[PDB]
Amino acid sequence: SVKEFLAKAKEDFLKKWETPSQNTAQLDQFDRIKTLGTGSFGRVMLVKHKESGNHYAMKILDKQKVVKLKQIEHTLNEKRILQAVNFPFLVKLEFSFKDNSNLYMVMEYVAGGEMFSHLRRIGRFSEPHARFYAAQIVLTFEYLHSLDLIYRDLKPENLLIDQQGYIQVTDFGFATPEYLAPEIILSKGYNKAVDWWALGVLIYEMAAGYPPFFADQPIQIYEKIVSGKVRFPSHFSSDLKDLLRNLLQVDLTKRFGNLKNGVNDIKNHKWFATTDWIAIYQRKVEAPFIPKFEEIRVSINEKCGKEFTEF
Numbered sequence: 001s002v003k004e005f006l007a008k009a010k011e012d013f014l015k016k017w018e019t020p021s022q023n024t025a026q027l028d029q030f031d032r033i034k035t036l037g038t039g040s041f042g043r044v045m046l047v048k049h050k051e052s053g054n055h056y057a058m059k060i061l062d063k064q065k066v067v068k069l070k071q072i073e074h075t076l077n078e079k080r081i082l083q084a085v086n087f088p089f090l091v092k093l094e095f096s097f098k099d100n101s102n103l104y105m106v107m108e109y110v111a112g113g114e115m116f117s118h119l120r121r122i123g124r125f126s127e128p129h130a131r132f133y134a135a136q137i138v139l140t141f142e143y144l145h146s147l148d149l150i151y152r153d154l155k156p157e158n159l160l161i162d163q164q165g166y167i168q169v170t171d172f173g174f175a176t177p178e179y180l181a182p183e184i185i186l187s188k189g190y191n192k193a194v195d196w197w198a199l200g201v202l203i204y205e206m207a208a209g210y211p212p213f214f215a216d217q218p219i220q221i222y223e224k225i226v227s228g229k230v231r232f233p234s235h236f237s238s239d240l241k242d243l244l245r246n247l248l249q250v251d252l253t254k255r256f257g258n259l260k261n262g263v264n265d266i267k268n269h270k271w272f273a274t275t276d277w278i279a280i281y282q283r284k285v286e287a288p289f290i291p292k293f294e295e296i297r298v299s300i301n302e303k304c305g306k307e308f309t310e311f
Contacts, residue, residue, distance in 0.1 A: 001277075001278065002277060002278070002281075003143075006142065006143065006146050008085070008144050009087070009143065009146075009170075010147065012086070013084050013085060013086070013147060014084075014088075016083060016084040017080065017081070017084040020079075020080055020083055020084070020211055020310075021083050021096075022096065022311065023096070023097045023098065024095045024096060024097060024099075025095040025106070026060030026097055026098055026099075027099060027104065027296065027298075029049060029050055029051065029107075030047040030048060030049050030050060030056070030058070031047060031048045031050060032046075032058075032294040032296075033045070033046045033047060033294070034046050034053075034294065035049055035294065039059060039061075040069065040107075041060070041061040041062050041065050041066050041071075041103075042059070042061050042062050042065075042102060042162050043060055044057055044058065044059045044060070045057065045058045045060065045294065046058075046109065048228035051197060054090065054109075055111070056094060056095075056106045056107060056108065056109050057106070057107040057108075057109050058104055058105070058106050058107075058184050059104070059105040059106075059107065060102050060103070060104060061075065061101060061102055061103035061104070061105070062101065062102055062103075063098075063101065063241060063303055063304040063307070063308055064101075064303055064304060064309040066103070066304075067304055067307060068241045071305050072308070073129040073176045075103070075311075076308070076310050076311060077175060078174065078175045079093070079096055079105060079311060080310075081174050082096075082105070082172075083096060087139045087140065087143050087182070088136075088138065088166070088170065088281065088283060089136045089137075089166065089167050089168060089169055090102070090140065090143075090169050091107055091110065091160075091169060091170040091171075091172070091308055092107070092108045092171060093105055093106065093107055093108075094106050094107065094108055096311070098311050099298050100298050100299040100300065100301060100302045100303060100309060101296075101297065101298040101299045102296065102298065103311060105279045107170075108168065109159070110160040110161070110162055110168045110170065111162070111163060111291065112160055112161030112162055112163065112165075112291040113160060113161060113291065114156070114157055114159065114161075114169065115133065115156070115159050115160065115161050116156050116158060116159070118161070118289055119205070119206060119209065123287075124206070124207060124208055124209030124210075125206045125207060126286075126288075127207060127237055127240060127271075128129075128274070129206075129288045129289075130203060130206035130207045131271070131274065131275060132270070132280075132285070132287065132288060133159075133167060133206060134199070134202070134206070134289070135272070135275050136166065136167045136175065136276065136280060137199055137202065138165070138199065138263075138266060138267065139277070140169060141195045141196070141199065141257075141263070142263045144195075145192045145195070145263070149174060149237070150190070150191070150192055150194070150195060151172075151195045151198065152173065152190070152194060152198075152200075153173065154176075154198040154201060154202060155171070155176070155179075156179075156202065158170045158171045161289070161291055163290075163291070164283065164287060164290065165287025165288065165289050165290045165291070166283060166287060166291045171284070177218045177221050177222070178201070178212075178213060178214055178221060179198060179201050179202075179211070180213040180222070180225060181194040181197040181198065181225075181249045182197070182225055182226050182228070182252070183226060183252055185222045185226055186226065188252075191254055191258075192257075192258065193252055193257065195257070196247055196255055196256055196257035196258065196266070197247065197248065197249075197255065197297060199247060199257075200212075200247030200248040202243055203243070203244060203247070204244055204248075206232075207233075207236060207240060208233050208236075212230050212244075213217070213225050213230070215224075216225070225250075226247070226250065227250075227297050228249070228250035229252075230244070230245075230248055232244070237271065239269070239270045239271035240271055241284050242269075242270070242271075243256075243266075243269055243270075243271045246265075246269075247266075276304065280308070
């Protein structure tokens with residue numbers, strides 16, 4: 001079923017990595033609305049595509065600053081990967097182009113805001129509601145790992161909600177103390193497994209309203225993490241308590257998703273009996289929460305054309 005699927009998404013991704021798509025639009029096809037924030041190389045702008053009326057985040061990159069800071073390589077690679085991946089729950093790079101001065105990466109724009117906005121509003125999610133999100137995350141993770149990519153750092157601020165109530169995982173890094181994984185703290189290095197720890201922490205916070213380990217000082221926090229003693233709230237279902245026990249396994253060798261049975265230990269567990277993994281993927285599942293409804297100086301002559309031919 002899914003075991004058949006991901007091999008084609010992988011087959012598809014590798015086709016795109018081997019032959020990258022370049023220069024898929026131009027600056028004047030969009031209206032520039034406001035600035036969302038700034039990177040080191042240019043600002044990021046909320047733009048609306050003139051033709052489709054769709055909204056996008058346009059990251060701008062001054063070719064020359066990218067050079068000065070010796071970031072040619074990372075950038076080209078960031079893009080190469082980005083144009084290559086395509087997953088429902090990851091924010092997609094929809095257009096990439098370049099002109100005399102700048103490099104442009106155009107991302108899907110997600111209106112709905114952080115899911116933590118909703119968590120903090122409600123207090124904490126019902127277990128089914130949280131299951132819903134967990135599911136997508138689980139898939140995403142499976143998907144990244146197949147491409148030998150690791151999510152690593154949990155920043156729940158990067159988990160946003162689309163028009164339909166699903167997740168888009170923005171700011172994907174491919175180049176907070178409370179969500180740190182044991183091995184990291186122990187400077188033991190890491191691997192695909194840390195993601196399941198993350199997943200663990202995440203589910204917890206969703207279901208609980210608060211993170212599992214927390215303290216006054218960071219040092220006290222790490223101790224709790226590493227200790228691997230977690231108190232559960234009175235209301236957690238047994239299946240939940242049990243799953244998290246398996247997910248928040250300090251013993252890297254004993255942590256679900258890293259077992260011989262792999263990611264499948266997780267999909268099959270009792271707390272995920274009620275989950276139609278396909279239907280979730282399809283996006284056919286009814287979502288619990290639907291949300292409420294600038295000059296660019298470009299040079300006359302081309303700079304650093306050589307360096308960014310691949311872009």
